[PDB]
Amino acid sequence: EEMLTQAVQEADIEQVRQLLERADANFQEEEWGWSPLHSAVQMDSEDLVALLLKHGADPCLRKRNGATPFIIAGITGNVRLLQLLLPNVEDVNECDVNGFTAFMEAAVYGRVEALRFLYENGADVNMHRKTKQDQERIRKGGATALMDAAEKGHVGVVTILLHAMKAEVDARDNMGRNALVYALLNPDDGKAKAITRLLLDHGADVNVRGEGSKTPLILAVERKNLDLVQMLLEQEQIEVNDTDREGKTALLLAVELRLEEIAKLLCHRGASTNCGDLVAIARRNYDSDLVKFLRLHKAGEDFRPPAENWKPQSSRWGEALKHLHRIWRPMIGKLKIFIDEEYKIADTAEGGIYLGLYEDQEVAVKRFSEGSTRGQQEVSCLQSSRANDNVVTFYGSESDGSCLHVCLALCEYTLQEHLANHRGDAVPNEEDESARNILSSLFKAIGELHRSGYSHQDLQPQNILIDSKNGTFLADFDKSIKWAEDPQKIKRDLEALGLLVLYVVKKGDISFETLKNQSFEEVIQGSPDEETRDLIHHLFHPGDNVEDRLSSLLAHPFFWSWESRYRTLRDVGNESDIKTRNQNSRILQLLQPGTLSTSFAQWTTKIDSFVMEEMNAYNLYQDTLGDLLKFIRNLGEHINEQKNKKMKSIIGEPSQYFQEKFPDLVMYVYTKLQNTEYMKHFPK
Amino acid sequence: SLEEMLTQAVQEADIEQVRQLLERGADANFQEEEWGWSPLHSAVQMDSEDLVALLLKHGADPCLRKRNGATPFIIAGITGNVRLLQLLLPNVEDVNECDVNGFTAFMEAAVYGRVEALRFLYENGADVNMHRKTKQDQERIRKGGATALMDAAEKGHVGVVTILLHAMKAEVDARDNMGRNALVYALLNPDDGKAKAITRLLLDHGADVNVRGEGSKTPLILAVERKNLDLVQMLLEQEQIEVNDTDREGKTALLLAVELRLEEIAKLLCHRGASTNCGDLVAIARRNYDSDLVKFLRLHKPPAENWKPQSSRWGEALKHLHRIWRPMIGKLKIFIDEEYKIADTAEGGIYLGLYEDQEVAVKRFSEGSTRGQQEVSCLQSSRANDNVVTFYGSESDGSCLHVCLALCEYTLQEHLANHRGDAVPNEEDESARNILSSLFKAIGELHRSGYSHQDLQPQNILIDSKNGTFLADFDKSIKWAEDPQKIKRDLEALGLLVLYVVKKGDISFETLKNQSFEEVIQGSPDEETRDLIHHLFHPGDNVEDRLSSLLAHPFFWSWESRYRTLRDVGNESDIKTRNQNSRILQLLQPSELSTSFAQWTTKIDSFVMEEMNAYLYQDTLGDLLKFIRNLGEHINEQKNKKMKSIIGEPSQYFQEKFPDLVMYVYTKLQNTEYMKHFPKT
Numbered sequence A: 001e002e003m004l005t006q007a008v009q010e011a012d013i014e015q016v017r018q019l020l021e022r023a024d025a026n027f028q029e030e031e032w033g034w035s036p037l038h039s040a041v042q043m044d045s046e047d048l049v050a051l052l053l054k055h056g057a058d059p060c061l062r063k064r065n066g067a068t069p070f071i072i073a074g075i076t077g078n079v080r081l082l083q084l085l086l087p088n089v090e091d092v093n094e095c096d097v098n099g100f101t102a103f104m105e106a107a108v109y110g111r112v113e114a115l116r117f118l119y120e121n122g123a124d125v126n127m128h129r130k131t132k133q134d135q136e137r138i139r140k141g142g143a144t145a146l147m148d149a150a151e152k153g154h155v156g157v158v159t160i161l162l163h164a165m166k167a168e169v170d171a172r173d174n175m176g177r178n179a180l181v182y183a184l185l186n187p188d189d190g191k192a193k194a195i196t197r198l199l200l201d202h203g204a205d206v207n208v209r210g211e212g213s214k215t216p217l218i219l220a221v222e223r224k225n226l227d228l229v230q231m232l233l234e235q236e237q238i239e240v241n242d243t244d245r246e247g248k249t250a251l252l253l254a255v256e257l258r259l260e261e262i263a264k265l266l267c268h269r270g271a272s273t274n275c276g277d278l279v280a281i282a283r284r285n286y287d288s289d290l291v292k293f294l295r296l297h298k299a300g301e302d303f304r305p306p307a308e309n310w311k312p313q314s315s316r317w318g319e320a321l322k323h324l325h326r327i328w329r330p331m332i333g334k335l336k337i338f339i340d341e342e343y344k345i346a347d348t349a350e351g352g353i354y355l356g357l358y359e360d361q362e363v364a365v366k367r368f369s370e371g372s373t374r375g376q377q378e379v380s381c382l383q384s385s386r387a388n389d390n391v392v393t394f395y396g397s398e399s400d401g402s403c404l405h406v407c408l409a410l411c412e413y414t415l416q417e418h419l420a421n422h423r424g425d426a427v428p429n430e431e432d433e434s435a436r437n438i439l440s441s442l443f444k445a446i447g448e449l450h451r452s453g454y455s456h457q458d459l460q461p462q463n464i465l466i467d468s469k470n471g472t473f474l475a476d477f478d479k480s481i482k483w484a485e486d487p488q489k490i491k492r493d494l495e496a497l498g499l500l501v502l503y504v505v506k507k508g509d510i511s512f513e514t515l516k517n518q519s520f521e522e523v524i525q526g527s528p529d530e531e532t533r534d535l536i537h538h539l540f541h542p543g544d545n546v547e548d549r550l551s552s553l554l555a556h557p558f559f560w561s562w563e564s565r566y567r568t569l570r571d572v573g574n575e576s577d578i579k580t581r582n583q584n585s586r587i588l589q590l591l592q593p594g595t596l597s598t599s600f601a602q603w604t605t606k607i608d609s610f611v612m613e614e615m616n617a618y619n620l621y622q623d624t625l626g627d628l629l630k631f632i633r634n635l636g637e638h639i640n641e642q643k644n645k646k647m648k649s650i651i652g653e654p655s656q657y658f659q660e661k662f663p664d665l666v667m668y669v670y671t672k673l674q675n676t677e678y679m680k681h682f683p684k
Numbered sequence B: 001s002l003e004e005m006l007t008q009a010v011q012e013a014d015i016e017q018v019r020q021l022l023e024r025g026a027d028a029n030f031q032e033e034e035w036g037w038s039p040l041h042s043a044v045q046m047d048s049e050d051l052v053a054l055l056l057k058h059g060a061d062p063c064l065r066k067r068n069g070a071t072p073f074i075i076a077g078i079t080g081n082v083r084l085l086q087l088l089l090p091n092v093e094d095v096n097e098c099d100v101n102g103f104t105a106f107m108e109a110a111v112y113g114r115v116e117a118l119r120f121l122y123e124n125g126a127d128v129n130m131h132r133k134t135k136q137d138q139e140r141i142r143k144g145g146a147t148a149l150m151d152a153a154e155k156g157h158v159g160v161v162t163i164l165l166h167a168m169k170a171e172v173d174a175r176d177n178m179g180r181n182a183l184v185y186a187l188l189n190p191d192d193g194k195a196k197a198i199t200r201l202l203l204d205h206g207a208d209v210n211v212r213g214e215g216s217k218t219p220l221i222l223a224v225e226r227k228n229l230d231l232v233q234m235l236l237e238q239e240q241i242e243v244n245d246t247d248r249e250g251k252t253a254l255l256l257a258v259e260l261r262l263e264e265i266a267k268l269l270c271h272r273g274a275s276t277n278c279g280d281l282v283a284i285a286r287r288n289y290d291s292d293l294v295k296f297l298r299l300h301k302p303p304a305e306n307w308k309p310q311s312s313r314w315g316e317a318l319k320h321l322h323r324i325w326r327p328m329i330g331k332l333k334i335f336i337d338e339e340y341k342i343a344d345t346a347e348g349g350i351y352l353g354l355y356e357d358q359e360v361a362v363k364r365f366s367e368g369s370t371r372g373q374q375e376v377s378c379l380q381s382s383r384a385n386d387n388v389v390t391f392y393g394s395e396s397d398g399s400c401l402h403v404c405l406a407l408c409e410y411t412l413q414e415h416l417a418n419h420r421g422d423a424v425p426n427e428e429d430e431s432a433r434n435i436l437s438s439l440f441k442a443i444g445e446l447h448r449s450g451y452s453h454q455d456l457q458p459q460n461i462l463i464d465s466k467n468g469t470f471l472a473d474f475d476k477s478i479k480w481a482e483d484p485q486k487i488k489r490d491l492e493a494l495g496l497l498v499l500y501v502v503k504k505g506d507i508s509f510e511t512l513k514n515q516s517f518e519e520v521i522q523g524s525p526d527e528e529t530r531d532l533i534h535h536l537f538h539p540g541d542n543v544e545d546r547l548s549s550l551l552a553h554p555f556f557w558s559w560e561s562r563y564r565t566l567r568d569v570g571n572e573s574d575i576k577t578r579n580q581n582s583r584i585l586q587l588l589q590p591s592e593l594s595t596s597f598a599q600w601t602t603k604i605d606s607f608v609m610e611e612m613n614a615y616l617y618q619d620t621l622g623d624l625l626k627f628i629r630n631l632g633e634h635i636n637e638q639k640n641k642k643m644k645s646i647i648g649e650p651s652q653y654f655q656e657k658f659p660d661l662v663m664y665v666y667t668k669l670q671n672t673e674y675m676k677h678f679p680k681t
């Protein structure tokens, strides 16, 4: 068991003694390096530190962060533990891996008596923390005990340090920050006031920069504290027109924040009034008195608003996005939004979809009550989908008081809109490349969504968005579920895909409503060609064994171009056994085995007689599939020879010709050669 | 210009010029188009009784709505001057008219803490327990329904709350649509005194103390998180308060108290029946160094390991990181320890993290850093670029900018090493094409986005679990507008990356960077690669398009597609009939340089040569293409079985015998009709 440590937790000294002479006193638990000696000091039991020191336990023994029970004594504050441990210590200024000494830890925990003790015993008071190189290269570390004490707001400790212990007031950390900055970050107003005063009077630089390139003055304004502002403005060397990183001056902030008194005070100390359109800002705040004051001085007449270079990307939403960028709005975290019909994209079962700006990027913002189960499902699924390239990009979510804003990539059109706009783009008898692109993206999207452990549960055309560059994206995961719990619910996504296949192949002419009321067989019968029929079938009957059946369907002839289909038929028809009509051969046994129900039964009679007619000078063309493939191959090769120019005009584009005359041909060949060596002739 | 001068005049509050213009005909119901502000609206807002009088004299409607639906009446409530309200009331149809968010003059009086105005409106029929009725979008997400009481409590207007409760019969346990009462509102006010005062009042009139605010927080929990003993005692004086209520994350008031290092409040909570099996409080106190509370917890008083990482390489450490306790920096859980370190960098290093409970790589910068700003800037614009590493977000802890990125398994370097033994020595390298086409897309799209990377190298290229390749490290990136010809450096580095990847990682990138352009070209194993690299060092003119055009280059064509193209060209009628006139042969008959297929008939095996002259093949390119076509068609016929064995795989044969052939044809037919014979790109 080796449960000594255990006993020290319970602090029962009899079991400890009993088992120092029955386990190791320097035994460190592997996770964090805690020794019983470390643990003893932490809980402040003099009896246990004594007992353990009487069994040789090293008081310079380091735990994971480099902490010795000595340094931990500084935290606990008890001076008689420090006394007990000091005689087995090489340096009193030994620091853990982040540069913390027992003295700093005394300053941090506001342990006044411990601080004095360590002062008398040689503790360095202006020691900056030396940390590991990772932390150094990002300018962390270098903080003093003064800074620690100021931050924590220990008024006691600051004063002692400054006056008794010669603490350096304008000591900087690696970020370039002095104790004054640290002081102003404390949430307690009095403590902060007290500590600022002390620090200021010893000569702390008042034009330092903290986080965000903010001065102490600006920190004070953002704190909304007249008192700290006056204290700071009593110094005459302070720069009042210093700007933070975003270019805001202390005054500007003051007006913005609706701080009449502090604004006035700032103006009466030489704060320039051309750091923003202050009147406008006061006006909008309904700060009538401050308006008047600012008007009296009239310093809102010399300031040009920036002329507006941000260029929206969306064309449909461009104009409104420009307006939204232009106007003033408060932020909800990283999100700028305004709930007005001008910026509304669409209605939803909760909250609607509005244009927004998120980290200055244009976005669609889907809104939910912050309670919402649906909002939680959406955000959950989106958070798992960031790798899925055919899912609408998720920027992030911002909660306000009572509303979950989900920010998504802005797309131009819905699938429905898009199909309508592009309905005239192909003449009736021309290949629909677009349908393939759309549907392959959806297959990938849903495939990947399933791999992610999610099922959509409401696939329909309103949930499918098209971007400026014709890319298609799946959206709306408010009804999604983790399928793991109920794996056969995936089937419903696949069914909806099946309806989407038809919807898209029909270029939006049949409504999705219509298609949802149809039975599986009605949908299949509605399919214009055999490839589509076969494809949809496989989606409505996916099989319990349906891991990644979506990905296998991307190889289906539906996704083959008409050139590739023709190319495949040609390549099969160039197999030597088809050319030599070797009926015994493997290929012909795959294609024509045994012994009329196909559109290419007696195919020679259905092709124009001249072509056939002139297609016969070499024993002849018979009505086998074999011979049709041969025919396709031969025409393929010779159609463009100059002597065949009449043939060419009768036929037109050969791929189109054969598929139209023989709609089942491509599918028939695919089926016969599917899992064979001749699969090699299929498209890429 | 006239109404504009009126409006303008009212701003300056020059009453003479207003008068002048009302009689000179100017309209006082003129609304500016942006926000709907009338001179009457504007007058009230700035509190000039003289101007509201003058304008009301001239028929100016006091029920005139601006963009949010607010009437100058409602705005008077904000101004809180009673004599404006007096002046406007005799034309008002309803005193409880609200703007589009449901705000009445009375609410606005409560909101701005305007005591005198509140009284006036009370006497004149203002409804005191009016909930805001807002538009249906806002309603469907349960916003709105707030009262003047709630407004006053939130704002912490102690005056107004008191009057409302006592004088004006305000309902204390009135709820908004979220289900919040004024108590919740009250506890959100940052000023301790005001909050204390208002809570007391509200509690004594019988405000429900078991209500839910944001985050499913009770009032009790809000008080704990505020760190305010006083507000906690007030709340715990009620005995019907549920002390073991949990917020959304399942944290109890006590738990929070221990977690936050609030000894006194923790003790008080235990002494009121707060159950001690809500978390491992001792451990928590222990870690806080809260010795006394430890002791107290010991004298008074978890397993759920189900999180599975996706990364296999990083899985075990990610499990540890998930398991341990760390404080959050916003949405980021991170621990700076060697165990969780992925790699070293120019500043901060790369560590494993959890971001919204998703595993991520975290790149660290000084929050000041120009470099960290460049990275975050470029990433924020790159979210559409599928071949750029996914950007989750950035969290600042106040001294350090944490940039969180998708965690990938391997670097390009590592990946090439792991897969170096997979292919036989001379196999076609499909993998190099995939990797490089992804990079071409990534950098192409990055340029289209206005950014250039400036430090493209194999350590900046990452491979995910599913063999996808991603560009990362935008710390030295720039908006290229600033110097457009610095794009060329990305293109050059791409050129070195082409070689690096074609050489399967065997040549170091260092090595390649020290070579001159001509040495790089000479080091290239084939003509496709040579030509491609050349075009990267000597680019065209289209920034975010050249790269996309180069995806059509024969380097990216499979060996089958190359062979297919040469066959299809060689089946053009004019090549077969040897029509020297013809357009195709004119395009193929260029001064020139010595090509490896000059007198090609002499260096193709003599048996094949003879068998193929099946009765005159000349040393033209035309005739070579014809040869390729014919062999293509007949190679598998049974009578050619000896030919087949000599040749082996025909694509490989021709490219190896004639390394410049594919390139030569590409170049001759590039921008012609016969481009149609190229593979679909």
Ligand SMILES: CCN(CC)CCNC(=O)c1c(C)[nH]c(/C=C2\C(=O)Nc3ccc(Cl)cc32)c1C
Residues within 6 Å of the ligand: A345, A346, A347, A353, A364, A366, A392, A408, A409, A410, A411, A412, A413, A414, A417, A465, A475, A476
């Ligand atoms: C075109 C008129 N028609 C009414 C019969 C449809 C009204 N518009 C929409 O339905 C609509 C449109 C045009 N776009 C959208 C949704 C968008 C949208 O347009 N962009 C977008 C980005 C992300 C998310 Cl989640 C949702 C969207 C919606 C819901």
Ligand SMILES: CCN(CC)CCNC(=O)c1c(C)[nH]c(/C=C2\C(=O)Nc3ccc(Cl)cc32)c1C
Residues within 6 Å of the ligand: B342, B343, B344, B350, B361, B363, B389, B405, B406, B407, B408, B409, B410, B411, B459, B462, B472, B473, B474
């Ligand atoms: C095998 C030792 N060798 C260096 C001595 C390589 C060790 N690892 C890496 O170099 C490395 C690895 C495994 N991953 C990364 C970088 C990653 C990384 O793995 N994910 C990731 C996300 C975003 C960004 Cl900006 C950078 C990265 C790096 C730099």
